[PDB]
Structure 1
Amino acid sequence: ARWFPKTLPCDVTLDVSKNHVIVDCTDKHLTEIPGGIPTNTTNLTLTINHIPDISPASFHRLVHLVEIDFRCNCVPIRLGSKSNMCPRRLQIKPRSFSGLTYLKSLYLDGNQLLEIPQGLPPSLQLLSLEANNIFSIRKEQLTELANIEILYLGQNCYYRNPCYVSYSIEKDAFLNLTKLKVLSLKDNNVTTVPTVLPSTLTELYLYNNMIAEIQEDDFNNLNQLQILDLSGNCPRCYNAPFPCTPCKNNSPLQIPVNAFDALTELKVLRLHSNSLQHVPPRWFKNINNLQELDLSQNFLAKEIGDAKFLHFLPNLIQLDLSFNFELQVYRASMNLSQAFSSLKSLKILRIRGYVFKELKSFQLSPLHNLQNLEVLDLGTNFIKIANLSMFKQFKRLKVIDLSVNKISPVLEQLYYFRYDKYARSCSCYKYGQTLDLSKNSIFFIKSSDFQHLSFLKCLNLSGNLISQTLNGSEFQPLAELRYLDFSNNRLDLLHSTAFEELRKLEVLDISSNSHYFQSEGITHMLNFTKNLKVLQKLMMNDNDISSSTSRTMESESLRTLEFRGNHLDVLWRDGDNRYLQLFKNLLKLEELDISKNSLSFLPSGVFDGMPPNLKNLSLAKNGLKSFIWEKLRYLKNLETLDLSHNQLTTVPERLSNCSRSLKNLILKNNQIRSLTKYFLQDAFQLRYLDLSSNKIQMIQKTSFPENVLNNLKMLLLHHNRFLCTCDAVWFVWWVQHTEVTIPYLATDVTCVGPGAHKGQSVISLDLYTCEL
């Protein structure tokens, strides 16, 4: 199928439309730039290798390069692997880049460089030098960058990559960069705003530095600026997860009342962790276009009850005031200034970490007539009391977020406290109105708790303390609810009428409710599904279910059942036939996950007990030591079979004789040491096959007929025990010449032997002596 096998250890992709030739050698354990890179290459990526040097030889033939991505070949010690430390900084020899007349983007982040690389071609639009050791910026070193438009210099002096001095920037070092639009000097030990900056700037990132004061004219000429981030200058250090040094005298970042007067195009202003105690209204007198304001992690608790500056922000879309509470103070209630009602455009309001005992409806009246408000986030406030009926006046909202509180009758998990959320490395909302009560202290629920909340589409009760026999009465008002997340509670399924009042429920999650399933003698009605007439997906993972009072689960609607992390091995104890049809009467079930059920064997009868339309079956991670492949004939609609992470040792003699429907067969991480002689014969309908991480030594053509292989959408073979003897000649030739997608050919499709060939890639194997 190929006359010239590809030996290059990189992926090569063809973007005919914009004439791009993409060569991606990411994470190929290279110690040199590989030979034979195509001369037409436009995008060359060498990220995460151990190439110690660049020289004119490096890209000599590659005159068409628009982008070199050479990140993280020598990353700073505390940021990189401690098992493969980089011994010496990347060495760049003169005029390695000057021949590349078309080069627009150069990424050299994370190479321990000491100076800005010189000799760069004047076509360059983007230069990236994050996580190097460059902490002095001189005008002279920037002359080469006349046409530069995006310049990243951050992370060159901070606690994970120290330079032990203040960052240095020469007066007007950036000024004659007349095209520069984005400048990022974050995480750099910078002490003053650099001046004068070019008025072309649209984005300026100065956050996480040691700037104590803003001068009146620091931003005087920047009439095109759209994003300004000054966060983390004079940080609020309480409970900081990183080493945190505050400004002296509990000082805030000092910003003169007129400092932003020139910023008429500013759409985003970030003032997170600046220890602000006041927000002067005068700041925003000439900014009418501001859309996003971040004021989290300051000391604005009292300002929130006053907040006159809000009257100047009628175009604001997002307001963040999270974590402004006064230390050691547990307020009685939330005091929102009436000025919030002048925020006519607000869609997102976040006030986590205000820290107060009781929320009452009148406290939210300033928001009552904000017509665009879509998200109200009051998480992590330790609220003990809130009458949920209160939110009848907020039907228009998409998400009401009370997550992580103490109520009783999606942002990353580190978000407000992490050092740099934007550091670069080397859900039920769509169903409609969401009330998120997850991670609260709700121990008991009753219908009145949800009075006037009939409009709700998703209710998140995950991680409460609900330890209750539901009988169909607790959710009566929730007549529109489509999604209930009830995971991490203590559901007691005594009654098969549980949840039946949720007559429009489509998704139910009762995962991690194992408490009552763990003790003998307790009644469990797993047939509670019959009463849920539009239920589409049921999750009951990690419930430790090893017994059931009912012997069948019933549903004519359910299409997906997740049953992972239970004890079907106990339910299907050999000799006990009573539960072999547990799933049989889920007539429209197509996907069944019964991985992690300690199923070391399948008793006869489980396959005949499967419902008739089963399409996706997972039996992964069961410790399965044997498997009657012929029993797959009962599964007449089977398309995906996941047998990964087991102890299987054989494949079927004729996959076509076991299932002439199967498309995806996943056998990774088993103990298979050989294939049957006619394994895939006539298995035409097959499209995806994972044999990786087994012990296969040989594969002959009879097992892998090409009438089958070339309609394979992927074939995974890596991490086996291939023996590269003259018996392997067909397999080696076929692998070298096939166009079927096989991952990790360059890195993990390897001979274990004999001796000479140990560790050698099958792709590079020369077997001419077999033909002499």
Structure 2
Amino acid sequence: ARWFPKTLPCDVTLDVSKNHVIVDCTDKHLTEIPGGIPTNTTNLTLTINHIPDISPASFHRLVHLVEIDFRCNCVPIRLGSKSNMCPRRLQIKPRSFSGLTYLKSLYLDGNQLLEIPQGLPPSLQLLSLEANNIFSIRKEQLTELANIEILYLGQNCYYRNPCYVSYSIEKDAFLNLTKLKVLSLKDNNVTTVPTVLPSTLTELYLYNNMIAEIQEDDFNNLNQLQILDLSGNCPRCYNAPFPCTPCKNNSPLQIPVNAFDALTELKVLRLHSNSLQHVPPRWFKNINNLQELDLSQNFLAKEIGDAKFLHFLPNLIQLDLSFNFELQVYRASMNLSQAFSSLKSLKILRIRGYVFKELKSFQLSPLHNLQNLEVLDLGTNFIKIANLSMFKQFKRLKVIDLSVNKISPYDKYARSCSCYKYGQTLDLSKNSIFFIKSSDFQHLSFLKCLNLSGNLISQTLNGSEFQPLAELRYLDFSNNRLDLLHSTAFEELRKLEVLDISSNSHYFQSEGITHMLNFTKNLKVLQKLMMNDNDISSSTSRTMESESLRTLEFRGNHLDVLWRDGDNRYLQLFKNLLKLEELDISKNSLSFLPSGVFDGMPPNLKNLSLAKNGLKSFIWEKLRYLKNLETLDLSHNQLTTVPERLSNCSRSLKNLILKNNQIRSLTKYFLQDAFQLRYLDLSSNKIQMIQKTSFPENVLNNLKMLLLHHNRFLCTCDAVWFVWWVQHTEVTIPYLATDVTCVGPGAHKGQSVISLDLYTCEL
């Protein structure tokens, strides 16, 4: 099959059409790069490791490298886990990258460098030096980057990685970079923008810095700029969960009126957390193609009432005005200006953090004509009175956020080391609704969704609550207190397809009261039912019936009491679910499955999940009754013995999952004649040996995935074929060189099975 044993502990991906040989050593804890790298490699990745340094002998016989990822080998003091500490910082000998004539990208983030390395090839187009200790920019060290295009010099001096010195950039340091397009100086303690910047810049990220004043001759040459991020300069420090230094006298970022003049191709402008109080319309005079405008965490509560600058943004797509409230000011209503009607191309409008008392109908009148408006975020506003019927005008919308408000009837780009698909959505989750009336949801027949998660509604539904919701296809009733006393629950939701009544264990924990689990009989088009984490311990109805239910999640419940010894009542609980194909009966404290319960299983079942249950002895001969089962899931269980013969067990099972099990040895005809298998998991086990008579190539040649890591393989001369099978077969085994180790014998401890060579076996 294979006579080329490659002991490389890194993943290899081949793309002949793209000429890409990707070697991936992510999270491999290597101290030195492995020997024998194929010379056709193009992409090279080395994440968090323990590699001390780099020498020119590292990339000596690799010229075709086009991407080198050396990110975060020695993470700084506060940016990563302190379980992997380097003795010192990273050092690079001179001319360590000059031999890479085809290099085009380099990632050196989080390695505690003092200055920019020298000797880089002129073909380099990307260079990222984030999370380093480079707080000084000069021209002589940038002369070699005359052909760079993307430069990430961010996260160099701030509270996570301090340097105690303001960012020093000499005059015209980036001027001679005629090919530079992206420049990110985020979290660098920058005092002034490094003028002059190259005129070919397209993305400028100067956010989360200490820039206090902007000059009129700052962006005077940037005519091709498209993204300008000045967020966090003079930030809003009140109740900030991060160390922030505000400006003196609580002054905002001093931006002149004639500042965004040369910016003509600007499409994204984020001024989030700048302590701004006024937004002059002169800023938006020359930027005609502005699409995204972030103005969050400011003091624009009085500006939103006027909002004159909105008259200069006819092509605005997004508008973030979150958390603009005043201190000790509880407003009675939201004061949206009429100029909001000038945003013709507006799609998303998030006005969170604008806390007020009552949301009336005519308060959203400027938004009554935005034909392109889809999302309307109004969460975290602590609204008290809000008649939902007023939303009968926003039918063309897609998301109506009515979040944690109490209606009643820093660096988000940190690259560290639902209902929107069904239609109209009313997200009333985490509100102060404690009972459901039919008149409250009136004039809301167009709703395809209704999220009532976390409202803590204690109500006995008899089939008269969600009456106006005729077109409802998804109802989220999680984190409440549902009382299933009548089988007529959710009977008026004719077009209901998905029902989530999870986390309603309050009334289900009680013993003796009626629990009609046959409430799905009146649901004719119900496709998915999520009732997990409900602690369902009893049920008056004996069976569950449905003409269309295909998915059922019954995890975190008590089937161990329903299938108790001698209690033959609830054995056929899911037998009448004809169209059921996806069962998720897991975490149900099931210590054993009583013989006969599989006879009360849906005949069309395909997906069975029995994870985190506690099965002490799961029988296998009863799987013949499930002639359509394909994805049996027995992960995180306490099984002891694997089946006798998988061929006699099932004819359609192909996705056996036995993760985190307790198995000490496989059988000797396990995979005999089980050709239909295509997926097997045996991770985190206690097995000792696996022979050949149970693993022939007729069955191994078709398996797509096979996980045999984190176990107790004893690598002695007892399973020599396994050796000849582990390093000479192309079956996909992930983590085959670092996680699956050898616990013995003696000097053979911790050895990888891929590099096994016992010459003293057949001398």
TM-score (normalised: structure 1)? 0.98
Q: Distance in 1 between matches of 2:618 and 2:535?
A: 24
For 2:490 and 2:168, the matched residues in 1 are separated by 64
CA distance in 2, matches of 1:531, 1:26: 52
User: Can you list the C-alpha shifts for 1:645-667, whole angstroms capped at 9, x where unaligned?
Assistant: 11111101101111111000001
**SS in structure 1 of the partner of residue 507 of structure 2:** helix
Provide the secondary structure at the position in 2 that maps to 1:596: coil
Alpha-carbon distance between aligned partners in 1 of 2:618 and 2:345, rounded to the nearest angstrom? 61
Alpha-carbon separation, structure 1, partners of 2:644 and 2:512 = 45
Correspondence 1:381 to 2:395? no
Tell me if 1:561 matches 2:547: no
Instruction: Answer yes or no: is the 8 Å Cα contact 2:231–2:272 preserved in 1.
Output: yes
Q: Determine the C-alpha separation between the residues in 2 that align with 1:377 and 1:267.
A: 22
What CA distance in whole angstroms lies between the structure 1 residues aligned with 2:40 and 2:446? 59
C-alpha displacement of 1:722: 1.0
Instruction: Find the aligned partners of 2:426 and 2:86 in 1 and give their Cα distance.
Output: 49
CA distance in 1, matches of 2:572, 2:87: 62
> 1:536 maps to what in 2?
527
State the Cα deviation string for residues 568-616 of structure 1 (Å, max 9, x = none). Answer: 0011111101000110000000010011000010011211111101101
Q: Deviations 1:684-712 (Å, cap 9, x if unpaired)?
A: 00011111111100111112122111101
Tell whether the 8 Å contact from 1:510 to 1:540 is kept in structure 2 after alignment: yes
Q: Distance in 2 between matches of 1:494 and 1:241?
A: 46
Contact 2:714 2:742 (8 Å CA) reproduced: yes
Aligned-partner Cα distance in 1 for 2:553–2:87: 48
Secondary structure of 2:393 counterpart: helix
The separation in 2 between residues aligned to 1:32 and 1:102, in whole angstroms, is: 23
- Contact 1:341–1:366 (Cα < 8 Å) also in 2: yes
Q: Is the 8 A contact 1:636 1:659 kept in 2?
A: yes
Q: Deviations over 1:86-136 (max 9, x none)?
A: 221111111110010010000011111111010000000000000111011
Q: Deviations over 1:237-286 (max 9, x none)?
A: 12212112211101001111111011111100000000000111111111
Question: How far apart, CA to CA, are the structure 1 residues paired with 2:328 and 2:97?
Answer: 57
Partner Cα separation in structure 1 for residue 596 and residue 160 of structure 2: 58
User: How many pairs were matched up?
Assistant: 763
Contact 2:71 2:107 in 1 (8 A): yes
Shift of residue 420, structure 1, vs aligned partner: 0.3
Q: Secondary structure at the match of 1:621?
A: coil
Aligned residues of 1:125 and 1:149 also touching (Cα < 8 A): yes
Partners of 1:278 and 1:300 within 8 A in 2: yes
CA deviation digits over 1:151-203, x for unaligned, max 9? 00000111111111111111110001011000000011111111001110011
- Kept in 1, the 8 Å contact 2:55–2:93? The answer is yes
Provide Cα deviations, 1:612-653, integer angstroms capped at 9, x if missing partner: 011010011011110111111111111011101111111011
1:196 maps to what in 2?
A: 196
Q: CA offsets, 1:727-758, max 9 Å, x none? A: 11011110111101001111011111111111
Q: Distance in 1 between matches of 2:652 and 2:304?
A: 63
The percentage of aligned residue pairs carrying the same residue is: 100
Cα deviation code 1:464-493 (max 9, x no counterpart): 121101111111111111111111111111
Q: Partners in 1 of 2:238 and 2:568 — Cα distance?
A: 60
Cα displacement (A) at 1:554: 0.6
CA contact (8 A) 1:77 1:86 kept: no
Aligned to 1:234: 234
CA offset digits 1:214-253 (Å, max 9, x no partner): 1111111101000000000011112212112211101001
Q: How does 1:187-336 map to 2 (within 5 A)?
A: 187-336=187-336
In structure 1, the residue matched to 2:438 is: 447
2:103 partner SS:
coil
Counterparts of 1:754 and 1:481, CA distance in 2: 63
Equivalent residues of 2:41, 2:65 under 8 A apart: yes
The answer to whether the 8 A contact 2:647-2:672 is kept is: yes
Shift of 1:46: 1.1
User: Following TM superposition, by how much is the alpha carbon of 1:50 offset from its aligned partner in structure 2, in angstroms?
Assistant: 1.3
8 Å CA contact retained: 1:28, 1:746: no
Q: Which moved more, 1:603-612 or 1:555-564?
A: 603-612
Paired with 2:723 and 2:536, the residues of 1 have a C-alpha distance of 48
Once the two structures are TM-superposed, the CA of residue 22 in structure 1 deviates from its matched residue by: 1.1
C-alpha separation in 2, matches of 1:197 and 1:714: 51
Tell me the residue number matched to 2:652. Answer: 661
> Counterpart of 1:606?
597
Alignment check: 8 A CA contact 2:511 2:537 kept: no
Once structures 1 and 2 are overlaid, which stretch shifts more, 80-89 or 504-513?
80-89
What secondary structure is seen at the aligned counterpart in 1 of 2:431? coil
Q: Which moved more, 1:82-91 or 1:575-584?
A: 82-91
- The aligned counterpart of 1:32 is 32
Q: Deviations over 1:326-383 (max 9, x none)?
A: 0121100111011111111111111001001100010000111111101110010000
Per the normalisation by structure 2, the TM-score is 0.99
Q: Distance in 2 between matches of 1:331 and 1:601?
A: 59
Unaligned runs of 5+ in 1: 410-418
**Greater Cα shift, 556-565 or 438-447:** 438-447
> Partners in 2 of 1:678 and 1:182 — Cα distance?
60
Aligned to 1:412: none
Contact 2:80 2:417 in 1 (8 A): no
SS in 2 for 1:394: coil
Tell me, in whole angstroms, the C-alpha distance in 1 between the residues paired with 2:78 and 2:139: 30
Check conservation: 1:454, 1:480, Cα contact below 8 A. Answer: yes
For residue 304 of structure 1, give the secondary structure of its aligned residue in structure 2: helix
3-state SS in 2 of match to 1:526: coil
Q: What is the SS of the residue equivalent to 1:763?
A: helix
CA contact (8 A) 2:291 2:318 kept: yes
Shift of residue 521 of structure 1? 2.1
**CA offset at residue 84 of structure 1?**
1.8
**Structure 1 runs of 4+ off > 3 angstroms?**
none
In structure 2, distance between residues paired with 1:255 and 1:468: 55
Deviation at 1:407, TM superposition (A): 0.6
> What secondary structure does 1:363 align onto?
helix
Give RMSD over aligned pairs. 0.8
Q: Which deviations, in whole Å up to 9, do the C-alpha atoms of 1:508-549 show, x marking residues without a partner?
A: 100101110112222111100000000000000100001011
Distance 1:90 1:625 in 2: 52
* Map of 2:607 onto structure 1: 616
Give 1:45 deviation, angstroms. 0.8
**Aligned mates of 2:142, 2:203 — CA distance in 1:** 19
Q: Which moved more, 1:80-89 or 1:361-370?
A: 80-89
82-91 or 118-127: bigger deviation = 82-91
What is the deviation of 1:80? 2.0
Give distance in 1, aligned partners of 2:514 and 2:305.
Answer: 53
**Separation of aligned partners in 2, 1:510 and 1:624:** 26
1:501 to 484, 492, 497: 492
Rounded to whole Å, the distance in 1 between the matches of 2:169 and 2:584 is: 58
CA deviation profile, 1:45-96 (whole Å, cap 9, x unmatched): 1112211111110010001111111111111121122122122111111111
Contact (CA 8 Å) 1:651, 1:675: kept in 2 or not? yes
The equivalent residue for 2:417 is 426
Partners of 1:357 and 1:516 in 2: CA distance: 33
Quote the residue 2:669 is aligned against. Answer: 678
* Structure 2 counterpart of 1:414: none
Runs of at least 5 residues in structure 2 that lack an aligned partner in the other structure = none
Partners of 2:566 and 2:244 in 1: how far apart? 64
Larger deviation, residues 84-93 vs 730-739: 84-93
**Aligned-residue offset at 1:288:** 1.0
Query: Could you tell me how far 1:670 is from its partner in structure 2?
Result: 1.1
**Separation in structure 1 between the aligned mates of residue 703 and residue 85 of structure 2, nearest angstrom:** 40
Distance 1:136 1:756 in 2: 51
CA contact (8 A) 1:134 1:156 kept: yes
